[PDB]
Design a protein around this ligand. Structure first.
Ligand SMILES: [Cl-]
Ligand SMILES: [Cl-]
Ligand SMILES: [Mg+2]
Ligand SMILES: [Mg+2]
Lengths: 128, 129
């Protein structure tokens, strides 16, 4: 509970996708530190504020049917950071779709997230 | 090339992995901006400039026997950045091992790598496959 060790990073990151897949918005939002920023998709301004991280997520996961799965292991550093590949199954244009995503996270001392960057574009989005 | 779009970033990144996979250390370096910054592994201090970058890559790759392959699609942005998952197979002490990596690249307006972060560690080395 201090800065996560690489093995522990592999744990918080993978929690984090479970939770997202099970749809627990409230549990997602206790993972973020108070000053934490969300860039999703990377390219677009950091979000920020705990009401605001919680409206972000509630806009993405509210309607309960999203499924998110890792598609390879969590790469983890020794300075409390990591990156992961995954896929998301969602709805676009009324129809089911997927989306391949990569997250990079830094974990502050308190084992909470501080930055989250998500990489994807249309170029990753596939209609099923 | 100017800043790269998203489709252009997917293609630049995938070529980096080939060039790595074939071991053309001058062609790799030349993908980088003249003043580019490598952090590999992210967290060890940034390797700066093509001289230093060349010394780095020669020391990883010059021994031979490294092969590198993507393991899913490149995740691109519209601000010339991306991210890709890949696996590096090598031979250590004559035992083969696999290393799972994600590189994160930021490209300039010539379409040269400005900055490369490589996320991995010792969790990510697996010495039976
Ligand atoms: Cl992977
Ligand atoms: Cl993937
Ligand atoms: Mg090849
Ligand atoms: Mg320049």
């Amino acid at each position: 509970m201090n800065l996560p060790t690489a093995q522990e990073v592999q744990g918080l990151m993978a929690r984090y996708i479970e939770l997202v897949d099970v749809g627990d918005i409230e549990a997602i939002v206790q993972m973020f530190a108070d000053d934490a920023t969300v860039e999703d998709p990377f390219g677009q301004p950091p979000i920020h504020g705990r009401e605001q991280i919680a409206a972000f997520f509630r806009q993405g996961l509210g309607g309960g049917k999203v499924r998110a799965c890792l598609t390879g292991p969590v790469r983890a550093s020794h300075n409390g950071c990591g990156a992961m590949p995954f896929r998301v199954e969602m709805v676009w244009n009324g129809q089911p779709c997927a989306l391949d995503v990569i997250d990079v996270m830094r974990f502050d001392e308190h084992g909470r997230i501080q930055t989250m960057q998500a990489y994807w574009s249309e170029v990753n989005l596939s209609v099923r």
